[PDB]
Amino acid sequence: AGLLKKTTGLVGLAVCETPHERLKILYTKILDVLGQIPKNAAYRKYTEQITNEKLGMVKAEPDVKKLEEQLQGGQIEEVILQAENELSLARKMLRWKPWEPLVEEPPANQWKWPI
């Protein structure tokens, strides 16, 4: 927390003055959209694993300065940007649905370099 840092050092990415609760409401949202994808899905299990866990201390620890090393992912102002990206993925692979087997096995030995 502390004094609002003037710039993030990355032009284009600004400083959000209320970062902790924005990260909160994002993390619930991806948990919310993750409700649609059935339980057996591996992507759901992976991100239901790192969402609530990473939602843990952001709910508990309110100091964004300590939140830097809680997530070890750089500045919070782009962590929420990354959280948005994860939300975009949840929307995207809700169409992709890759849990079916391969569309096609690779035609004969198209792999197996060298020829």
Binding site: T7, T8, G9, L10, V11, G12, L13, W113
Partner: protein, 179 residues
Amino acid sequence: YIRPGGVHQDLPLGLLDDIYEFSKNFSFRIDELEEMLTNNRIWRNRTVDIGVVTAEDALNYGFSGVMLRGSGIQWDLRKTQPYDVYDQVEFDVPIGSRGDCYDRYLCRVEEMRQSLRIISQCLNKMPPGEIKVDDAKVSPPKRAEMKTSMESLIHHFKLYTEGYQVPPGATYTAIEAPK
């Protein structure tokens, strides 16, 4: 000069001395440029706040090197993925914080000075030893050994006509070329 397996030849005797003399005087020449351009209004107004890009677009556009570091992106190949002996040397990557034309210019001139740091360190810590690998199958044998030893002659013959056969596979290697 830079061949697979090291370098083709060794430096002429005393070459480290002359480049050391150049290194001492070169920092003055960098000061010469900064005096000439850095504080000049005309240069700044033709350069400052010009061609600015955000960090995300710069990274998504596939940019690299100064194009990212000028926009504040914290990345450099020599530091993040140190190839060759770049790990055993320290240097200050000149990260800007505007992304416009001016930030990259100051980023470059500092990279000039930080390059001069590398010359100084490698000069005081130049190790002895051979210039190429000790494997004739990929490194041509020494000329003296060429004209006295059969296996040198065969390996030299096959290396300069057929060449070393590289095992199959694929590899995209990456270095931070000043571009």
